[PDB]
Amino acid sequence: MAHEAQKAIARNSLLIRSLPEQHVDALLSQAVWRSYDRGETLFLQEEKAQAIHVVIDGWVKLFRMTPTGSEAVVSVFTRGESFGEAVALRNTPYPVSAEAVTPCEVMHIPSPVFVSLMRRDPEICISILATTFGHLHSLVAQLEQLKAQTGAQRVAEFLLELCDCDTGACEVTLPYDKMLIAGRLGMKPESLSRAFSRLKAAGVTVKRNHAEIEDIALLRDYAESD
Amino acid sequence: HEAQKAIARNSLLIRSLPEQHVDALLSQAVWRSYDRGETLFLQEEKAQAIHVVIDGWVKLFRMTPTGSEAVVSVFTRGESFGEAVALRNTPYPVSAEAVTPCEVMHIPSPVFVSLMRRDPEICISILATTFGHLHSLVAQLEQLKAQTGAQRVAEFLLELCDCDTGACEVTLPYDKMLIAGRLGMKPESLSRAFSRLKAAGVTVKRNHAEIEDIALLRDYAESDSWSK
Ligand SMILES: [Cl-]
Ligand SMILES: [Cl-]
């Protein structure tokens, strides 16, 4: 009933990071909390965009229906990540469907709660926009400086970012279907496997539904190498 | 100023706006030219405009506590800056100065802010666009980069040309360290990179770079060493 740990996780989302601190808790106080089993749908393409979504635990995939009826995976999101901001603010119908890929918990911020806040007080929207512009310039600068690295280094970094702590050993849940991560990391399915094999030597075991980092420092050291 | 207005539309600032309001905002622009070394603004002054570079290079810098210029950013043709500080009405954290002669478009802040105070739906619309772009940039930062330094330099150059075919010359600052910093490259490497780009028809002079063939430079950049 406090959702203290869960709100702490939500504060790392793009949505929550963009808000001025004075308004964070009041917005989180109006959250709609839900759990989903593996395979369960959060929403379907063309439905009304009733909320902004923040994954607290698990993996959620977004997919679009193609003209020939296949499902194209557009994104995969996990712990501490938000999605749906733009569609919610424009009030356009969902352009994708969303489905729990693992069992998961989501914090939903109802669209009217967030939109109405901004219709009421323009100072809030101006203030959030200021923050998002700064964040944009910052990401563009990171892209301009992004150097090449190895696929294994990408996967290490990814895995490191999924742990949150700086020391010890660790478990991280991963989807069964490994193509989801490959898409997210912009890698070939082979390359990801190749990448995994190479990480054995850095202390990483990759089971069917989870990965294990024997030691963070070693992995972190592997990621920060030639 | 239609050609100059066209270049401004490439900026982060103008891209993010509702298309149906652009022209009226662009209509209240103050256009200014700057000599090399001329100040655009200085640290602690009031942010009263958002700036878009129309031509040339502008560097932003802070003073180290021991009194040294520490360059923070360099902006060129079609790029905007000062959005956040102007919308927050806080003092400038840096100074800005023309590295080359330049043209810049200034958007008075009150023009922009009063529009949103009058109709918060404008800001709601702009914010939707800035969130979608944020997501796109974050997605792109997770995807494996494989390109070499010379390829990155190649892409940097290609993006400065704005034409898909033929030849172009792009103004570059005299001091190539400003580009090195922007690309997150050791100055050594930037030079090493320019050497390797000789093969793709890129000759780098004092105040400019000459691209003999765009398509050929795009080919080097896209390649997975290499040859003409
Ligand atoms: Cl399960
Ligand atoms: Cl004037």
PDB file of all heavy atoms in Angstrom, chain A residues 108-136:
ATOM      1  N   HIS A 108       0.288   2.481 -14.063  1.00  0.00           N
ATOM      2  CA  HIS A 108      -0.375   3.265 -15.096  1.00  0.00           C
ATOM      3  C   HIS A 108      -0.747   4.645 -14.557  1.00  0.00           C
ATOM      4  O   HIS A 108      -1.337   4.748 -13.495  1.00  0.00           O
ATOM      5  CB  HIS A 108      -1.656   2.598 -15.580  1.00  0.00           C
ATOM      6  CG  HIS A 108      -1.500   1.179 -16.059  1.00  0.00           C
ATOM      7  ND1 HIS A 108      -0.974   0.859 -17.293  1.00  0.00           N
ATOM      8  CD2 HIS A 108      -1.888   0.002 -15.505  1.00  0.00           C
ATOM      9  CE1 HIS A 108      -1.016  -0.451 -17.464  1.00  0.00           C
ATOM     10  NE2 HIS A 108      -1.559  -0.995 -16.396  1.00  0.00           N
ATOM     11  N   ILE A 109      -0.376   5.702 -15.278  1.00  0.00           N
ATOM     12  CA  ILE A 109      -0.780   7.034 -14.928  1.00  0.00           C
ATOM     13  C   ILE A 109      -1.905   7.347 -15.908  1.00  0.00           C
ATOM     14  O   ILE A 109      -1.684   7.374 -17.122  1.00  0.00           O
ATOM     15  CB  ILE A 109       0.350   8.061 -15.057  1.00  0.00           C
ATOM     16  CG1 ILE A 109       1.566   7.649 -14.198  1.00  0.00           C
ATOM     17  CG2 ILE A 109      -0.191   9.492 -14.770  1.00  0.00           C
ATOM     18  CD1 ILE A 109       1.385   7.587 -12.649  1.00  0.00           C
ATOM     19  N   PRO A 110      -3.140   7.521 -15.408  1.00  0.00           N
ATOM     20  CA  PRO A 110      -4.255   7.843 -16.316  1.00  0.00           C
ATOM     21  C   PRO A 110      -4.017   9.122 -17.123  1.00  0.00           C
ATOM     22  O   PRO A 110      -3.603  10.112 -16.555  1.00  0.00           O
ATOM     23  CB  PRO A 110      -5.450   8.050 -15.363  1.00  0.00           C
ATOM     24  CG  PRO A 110      -5.104   7.318 -14.171  1.00  0.00           C
ATOM     25  CD  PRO A 110      -3.587   7.467 -14.006  1.00  0.00           C
ATOM     26  N   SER A 111      -4.289   9.088 -18.417  1.00  0.00           N
ATOM     27  CA  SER A 111      -4.064  10.231 -19.298  1.00  0.00           C
ATOM     28  C   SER A 111      -4.735  11.529 -18.788  1.00  0.00           C
ATOM     29  O   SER A 111      -4.091  12.558 -18.751  1.00  0.00           O
ATOM     30  CB  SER A 111      -4.520   9.923 -20.724  1.00  0.00           C
ATOM     31  OG  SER A 111      -3.900   8.757 -21.253  1.00  0.00           O
ATOM     32  N   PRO A 112      -6.003  11.467 -18.357  1.00  0.00           N
ATOM     33  CA  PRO A 112      -6.656  12.673 -17.884  1.00  0.00           C
ATOM     34  C   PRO A 112      -5.985  13.295 -16.674  1.00  0.00           C
ATOM     35  O   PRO A 112      -5.999  14.517 -16.551  1.00  0.00           O
ATOM     36  CB  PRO A 112      -8.065  12.178 -17.524  1.00  0.00           C
ATOM     37  CG  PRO A 112      -8.298  11.011 -18.463  1.00  0.00           C
ATOM     38  CD  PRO A 112      -6.946  10.327 -18.340  1.00  0.00           C
ATOM     39  N   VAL A 113      -5.398  12.484 -15.797  1.00  0.00           N
ATOM     40  CA  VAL A 113      -4.703  13.014 -14.646  1.00  0.00           C
ATOM     41  C   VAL A 113      -3.496  13.851 -15.111  1.00  0.00           C
ATOM     42  O   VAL A 113      -3.315  14.988 -14.700  1.00  0.00           O
ATOM     43  CB  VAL A 113      -4.223  11.898 -13.695  1.00  0.00           C
ATOM     44  CG1 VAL A 113      -3.278  12.453 -12.607  1.00  0.00           C
ATOM     45  CG2 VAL A 113      -5.413  11.145 -13.062  1.00  0.00           C
ATOM     46  N   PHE A 114      -2.690  13.294 -15.993  1.00  0.00           N
ATOM     47  CA  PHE A 114      -1.495  13.972 -16.472  1.00  0.00           C
ATOM     48  C   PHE A 114      -1.807  15.144 -17.420  1.00  0.00           C
ATOM     49  O   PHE A 114      -1.220  16.221 -17.288  1.00  0.00           O
ATOM     50  CB  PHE A 114      -0.575  12.965 -17.163  1.00  0.00           C
ATOM     51  CG  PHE A 114       0.731  13.523 -17.544  1.00  0.00           C
ATOM     52  CD1 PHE A 114       1.696  13.739 -16.589  1.00  0.00           C
ATOM     53  CD2 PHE A 114       1.019  13.846 -18.849  1.00  0.00           C
ATOM     54  CE1 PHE A 114       2.906  14.271 -16.931  1.00  0.00           C
ATOM     55  CE2 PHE A 114       2.264  14.358 -19.196  1.00  0.00           C
ATOM     56  CZ  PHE A 114       3.194  14.581 -18.228  1.00  0.00           C
ATOM     57  N   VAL A 115      -2.705  14.933 -18.373  1.00  0.00           N
ATOM     58  CA  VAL A 115      -3.077  15.986 -19.319  1.00  0.00           C
ATOM     59  C   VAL A 115      -3.789  17.158 -18.635  1.00  0.00           C
ATOM     60  O   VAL A 115      -3.512  18.336 -18.924  1.00  0.00           O
ATOM     61  CB  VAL A 115      -4.000  15.469 -20.430  1.00  0.00           C
ATOM     62  CG1 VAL A 115      -4.681  16.669 -21.147  1.00  0.00           C
ATOM     63  CG2 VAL A 115      -3.235  14.536 -21.393  1.00  0.00           C
ATOM     64  N   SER A 116      -4.672  16.837 -17.700  1.00  0.00           N
ATOM     65  CA  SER A 116      -5.446  17.880 -17.037  1.00  0.00           C
ATOM     66  C   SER A 116      -4.536  18.746 -16.214  1.00  0.00           C
ATOM     67  O   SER A 116      -4.751  19.919 -16.154  1.00  0.00           O
ATOM     68  CB  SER A 116      -6.588  17.314 -16.170  1.00  0.00           C
ATOM     69  OG  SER A 116      -6.080  16.803 -14.968  1.00  0.00           O
ATOM     70  N   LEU A 117      -3.525  18.161 -15.589  1.00  0.00           N
ATOM     71  CA  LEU A 117      -2.537  18.913 -14.802  1.00  0.00           C
ATOM     72  C   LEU A 117      -1.930  20.031 -15.632  1.00  0.00           C
ATOM     73  O   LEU A 117      -1.765  21.172 -15.181  1.00  0.00           O
ATOM     74  CB  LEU A 117      -1.416  17.983 -14.315  1.00  0.00           C
ATOM     75  CG  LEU A 117      -0.260  18.563 -13.490  1.00  0.00           C
ATOM     76  CD1 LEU A 117      -0.736  19.051 -12.158  1.00  0.00           C
ATOM     77  CD2 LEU A 117       0.844  17.527 -13.296  1.00  0.00           C
ATOM     78  N   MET A 118      -1.638  19.692 -16.872  1.00  0.00           N
ATOM     79  CA  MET A 118      -1.024  20.625 -17.802  1.00  0.00           C
ATOM     80  C   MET A 118      -1.987  21.593 -18.460  1.00  0.00           C
ATOM     81  O   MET A 118      -1.592  22.723 -18.728  1.00  0.00           O
ATOM     82  CB  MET A 118      -0.267  19.792 -18.793  1.00  0.00           C
ATOM     83  CG  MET A 118       0.805  19.062 -17.925  1.00  0.00           C
ATOM     84  SD  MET A 118       2.182  18.362 -18.866  1.00  0.00           S
ATOM     85  CE  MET A 118       0.985  17.410 -20.118  1.00  0.00           C
ATOM     86  N   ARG A 119      -3.243  21.187 -18.666  1.00  0.00           N
ATOM     87  CA  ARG A 119      -4.230  22.135 -19.137  1.00  0.00           C
ATOM     88  C   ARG A 119      -4.448  23.181 -18.065  1.00  0.00           C
ATOM     89  O   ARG A 119      -4.578  24.337 -18.389  1.00  0.00           O
ATOM     90  CB  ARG A 119      -5.529  21.460 -19.502  1.00  0.00           C
ATOM     91  CG  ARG A 119      -5.464  20.881 -20.839  1.00  0.00           C
ATOM     92  CD  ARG A 119      -6.596  19.959 -21.157  1.00  0.00           C
ATOM     93  NE  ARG A 119      -6.396  19.499 -22.511  1.00  0.00           N
ATOM     94  CZ  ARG A 119      -6.998  18.449 -23.063  1.00  0.00           C
ATOM     95  NH1 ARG A 119      -7.846  17.685 -22.377  1.00  0.00           N
ATOM     96  NH2 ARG A 119      -6.705  18.131 -24.326  1.00  0.00           N
ATOM     97  N   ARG A 120      -4.425  22.786 -16.800  1.00  0.00           N
ATOM     98  CA  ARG A 120      -4.654  23.714 -15.691  1.00  0.00           C
ATOM     99  C   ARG A 120      -3.595  24.775 -15.466  1.00  0.00           C
ATOM    100  O   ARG A 120      -3.910  25.918 -15.166  1.00  0.00           O
ATOM    101  CB  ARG A 120      -4.783  22.955 -14.356  1.00  0.00           C
ATOM    102  CG  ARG A 120      -6.102  22.213 -14.195  1.00  0.00           C
ATOM    103  CD  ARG A 120      -6.337  21.818 -12.711  1.00  0.00           C
ATOM    104  NE  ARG A 120      -5.224  21.054 -12.135  1.00  0.00           N
ATOM    105  CZ  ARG A 120      -5.070  19.723 -12.195  1.00  0.00           C
ATOM    106  NH1 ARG A 120      -5.948  18.931 -12.810  1.00  0.00           N
ATOM    107  NH2 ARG A 120      -3.992  19.179 -11.625  1.00  0.00           N
ATOM    108  N   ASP A 121      -2.340  24.368 -15.539  1.00  0.00           N
ATOM    109  CA  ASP A 121      -1.248  25.257 -15.216  1.00  0.00           C
ATOM    110  C   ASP A 121      -0.151  25.179 -16.272  1.00  0.00           C
ATOM    111  O   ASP A 121       0.666  24.251 -16.274  1.00  0.00           O
ATOM    112  CB  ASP A 121      -0.741  24.863 -13.849  1.00  0.00           C
ATOM    113  CG  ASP A 121       0.264  25.805 -13.306  1.00  0.00           C
ATOM    114  OD1 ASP A 121       0.763  26.680 -14.055  1.00  0.00           O
ATOM    115  OD2 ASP A 121       0.537  25.658 -12.083  1.00  0.00           O
ATOM    116  N   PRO A 122      -0.162  26.138 -17.201  1.00  0.00           N
ATOM    117  CA  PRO A 122       0.840  26.213 -18.264  1.00  0.00           C
ATOM    118  C   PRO A 122       2.256  26.257 -17.759  1.00  0.00           C
ATOM    119  O   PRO A 122       3.146  25.827 -18.460  1.00  0.00           O
ATOM    120  CB  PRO A 122       0.516  27.549 -18.969  1.00  0.00           C
ATOM    121  CG  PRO A 122      -0.901  27.752 -18.715  1.00  0.00           C
ATOM    122  CD  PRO A 122      -1.136  27.234 -17.314  1.00  0.00           C
ATOM    123  N   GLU A 123       2.471  26.768 -16.560  1.00  0.00           N
ATOM    124  CA  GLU A 123       3.804  26.814 -16.020  1.00  0.00           C
ATOM    125  C   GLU A 123       4.387  25.415 -15.858  1.00  0.00           C
ATOM    126  O   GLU A 123       5.596  25.218 -15.985  1.00  0.00           O
ATOM    127  CB  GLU A 123       3.802  27.499 -14.661  1.00  0.00           C
ATOM    128  CG  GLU A 123       3.330  28.972 -14.660  1.00  0.00           C
ATOM    129  CD  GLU A 123       4.038  29.804 -15.693  1.00  0.00           C
ATOM    130  OE1 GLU A 123       5.247  30.079 -15.535  1.00  0.00           O
ATOM    131  OE2 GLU A 123       3.383  30.171 -16.676  1.00  0.00           O
ATOM    132  N   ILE A 124       3.541  24.446 -15.550  1.00  0.00           N
ATOM    133  CA  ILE A 124       4.001  23.092 -15.385  1.00  0.00           C
ATOM    134  C   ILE A 124       4.452  22.573 -16.781  1.00  0.00           C
ATOM    135  O   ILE A 124       5.564  22.082 -16.924  1.00  0.00           O
ATOM    136  CB  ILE A 124       2.937  22.235 -14.760  1.00  0.00           C
ATOM    137  CG1 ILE A 124       2.580  22.750 -13.345  1.00  0.00           C
ATOM    138  CG2 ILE A 124       3.393  20.791 -14.691  1.00  0.00           C
ATOM    139  CD1 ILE A 124       1.269  22.086 -12.744  1.00  0.00           C
ATOM    140  N   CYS A 125       3.614  22.705 -17.795  1.00  0.00           N
ATOM    141  CA  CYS A 125       3.980  22.196 -19.104  1.00  0.00           C
ATOM    142  C   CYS A 125       5.256  22.869 -19.662  1.00  0.00           C
ATOM    143  O   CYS A 125       6.080  22.201 -20.274  1.00  0.00           O
ATOM    144  CB  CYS A 125       2.801  22.361 -20.066  1.00  0.00           C
ATOM    145  SG  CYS A 125       2.948  21.371 -21.527  1.00  0.00           S
ATOM    146  N   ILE A 126       5.416  24.174 -19.455  1.00  0.00           N
ATOM    147  CA  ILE A 126       6.600  24.897 -19.880  1.00  0.00           C
ATOM    148  C   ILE A 126       7.880  24.380 -19.182  1.00  0.00           C
ATOM    149  O   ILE A 126       8.945  24.261 -19.767  1.00  0.00           O
ATOM    150  CB  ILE A 126       6.428  26.398 -19.551  1.00  0.00           C
ATOM    151  CG1 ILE A 126       5.380  27.073 -20.470  1.00  0.00           C
ATOM    152  CG2 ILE A 126       7.726  27.161 -19.681  1.00  0.00           C
ATOM    153  CD1 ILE A 126       4.991  28.504 -19.940  1.00  0.00           C
ATOM    154  N   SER A 127       7.723  24.083 -17.912  1.00  0.00           N
ATOM    155  CA  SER A 127       8.766  23.583 -17.065  1.00  0.00           C
ATOM    156  C   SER A 127       9.172  22.163 -17.507  1.00  0.00           C
ATOM    157  O   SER A 127      10.323  21.857 -17.590  1.00  0.00           O
ATOM    158  CB  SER A 127       8.228  23.631 -15.632  1.00  0.00           C
ATOM    159  OG  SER A 127       9.097  23.018 -14.745  1.00  0.00           O
ATOM    160  N   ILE A 128       8.212  21.311 -17.839  1.00  0.00           N
ATOM    161  CA  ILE A 128       8.515  19.966 -18.317  1.00  0.00           C
ATOM    162  C   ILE A 128       9.167  20.002 -19.703  1.00  0.00           C
ATOM    163  O   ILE A 128      10.089  19.253 -19.982  1.00  0.00           O
ATOM    164  CB  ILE A 128       7.266  19.089 -18.352  1.00  0.00           C
ATOM    165  CG1 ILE A 128       6.734  18.896 -16.908  1.00  0.00           C
ATOM    166  CG2 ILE A 128       7.584  17.738 -19.075  1.00  0.00           C
ATOM    167  CD1 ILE A 128       5.407  18.207 -16.815  1.00  0.00           C
ATOM    168  N   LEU A 129       8.699  20.893 -20.550  1.00  0.00           N
ATOM    169  CA  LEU A 129       9.259  21.048 -21.869  1.00  0.00           C
ATOM    170  C   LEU A 129      10.707  21.509 -21.772  1.00  0.00           C
ATOM    171  O   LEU A 129      11.537  21.083 -22.570  1.00  0.00           O
ATOM    172  CB  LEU A 129       8.452  22.052 -22.667  1.00  0.00           C
ATOM    173  CG  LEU A 129       8.761  22.273 -24.147  1.00  0.00           C
ATOM    174  CD1 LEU A 129       8.598  20.982 -25.044  1.00  0.00           C
ATOM    175  CD2 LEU A 129       7.867  23.409 -24.645  1.00  0.00           C
ATOM    176  N   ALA A 130      11.016  22.357 -20.795  1.00  0.00           N
ATOM    177  CA  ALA A 130      12.357  22.866 -20.649  1.00  0.00           C
ATOM    178  C   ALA A 130      13.254  21.667 -20.357  1.00  0.00           C
ATOM    179  O   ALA A 130      14.286  21.487 -20.976  1.00  0.00           O
ATOM    180  CB  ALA A 130      12.445  23.903 -19.544  1.00  0.00           C
ATOM    181  N   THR A 131      12.829  20.840 -19.424  1.00  0.00           N
ATOM    182  CA  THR A 131      13.598  19.672 -19.067  1.00  0.00           C
ATOM    183  C   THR A 131      13.782  18.716 -20.266  1.00  0.00           C
ATOM    184  O   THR A 131      14.888  18.266 -20.529  1.00  0.00           O
ATOM    185  CB  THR A 131      12.911  19.005 -17.911  1.00  0.00           C
ATOM    186  OG1 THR A 131      12.927  19.951 -16.848  1.00  0.00           O
ATOM    187  CG2 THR A 131      13.617  17.717 -17.510  1.00  0.00           C
ATOM    188  N   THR A 132      12.726  18.490 -21.036  1.00  0.00           N
ATOM    189  CA  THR A 132      12.829  17.571 -22.141  1.00  0.00           C
ATOM    190  C   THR A 132      13.771  18.117 -23.212  1.00  0.00           C
ATOM    191  O   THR A 132      14.467  17.313 -23.847  1.00  0.00           O
ATOM    192  CB  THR A 132      11.446  17.216 -22.750  1.00  0.00           C
ATOM    193  OG1 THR A 132      10.924  18.345 -23.452  1.00  0.00           O
ATOM    194  CG2 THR A 132      10.491  16.786 -21.655  1.00  0.00           C
ATOM    195  N   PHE A 133      13.831  19.446 -23.397  1.00  0.00           N
ATOM    196  CA  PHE A 133      14.776  20.021 -24.387  1.00  0.00           C
ATOM    197  C   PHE A 133      16.224  19.792 -23.985  1.00  0.00           C
ATOM    198  O   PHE A 133      17.076  19.502 -24.832  1.00  0.00           O
ATOM    199  CB  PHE A 133      14.587  21.514 -24.646  1.00  0.00           C
ATOM    200  CG  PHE A 133      13.575  21.818 -25.699  1.00  0.00           C
ATOM    201  CD1 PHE A 133      12.425  22.495 -25.391  1.00  0.00           C
ATOM    202  CD2 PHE A 133      13.826  21.489 -27.028  1.00  0.00           C
ATOM    203  CE1 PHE A 133      11.495  22.810 -26.388  1.00  0.00           C
ATOM    204  CE2 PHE A 133      12.929  21.776 -27.997  1.00  0.00           C
ATOM    205  CZ  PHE A 133      11.741  22.430 -27.692  1.00  0.00           C
ATOM    206  N   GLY A 134      16.484  19.938 -22.710  1.00  0.00           N
ATOM    207  CA  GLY A 134      17.816  19.699 -22.174  1.00  0.00           C
ATOM    208  C   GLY A 134      18.202  18.256 -22.366  1.00  0.00           C
ATOM    209  O   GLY A 134      19.296  17.981 -22.823  1.00  0.00           O
ATOM    210  N   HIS A 135      17.290  17.357 -21.998  1.00  0.00           N
ATOM    211  CA  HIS A 135      17.483  15.933 -22.156  1.00  0.00           C
ATOM    212  C   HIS A 135      17.752  15.578 -23.632  1.00  0.00           C
ATOM    213  O   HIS A 135      18.588  14.728 -23.923  1.00  0.00           O
ATOM    214  CB  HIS A 135      16.263  15.139 -21.636  1.00  0.00           C
ATOM    215  CG  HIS A 135      16.114  15.093 -20.133  1.00  0.00           C
ATOM    216  ND1 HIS A 135      17.186  15.112 -19.263  1.00  0.00           N
ATOM    217  CD2 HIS A 135      15.013  14.885 -19.358  1.00  0.00           C
ATOM    218  CE1 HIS A 135      16.750  15.005 -18.019  1.00  0.00           C
ATOM    219  NE2 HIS A 135      15.436  14.854 -18.047  1.00  0.00           N
ATOM    220  N   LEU A 136      17.056  16.232 -24.557  1.00  0.00           N
ATOM    221  CA  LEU A 136      17.254  15.999 -25.988  1.00  0.00           C
ATOM    222  C   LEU A 136      18.670  16.372 -26.479  1.00  0.00           C
ATOM    223  O   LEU A 136      19.259  15.640 -27.235  1.00  0.00           O
ATOM    224  CB  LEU A 136      16.242  16.774 -26.864  1.00  0.00           C
ATOM    225  CG  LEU A 136      14.791  16.307 -27.031  1.00  0.00           C
ATOM    226  CD1 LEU A 136      13.996  17.373 -27.775  1.00  0.00           C
ATOM    227  CD2 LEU A 136      14.691  14.939 -27.745  1.00  0.00           C
TER     228      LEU A 136
END
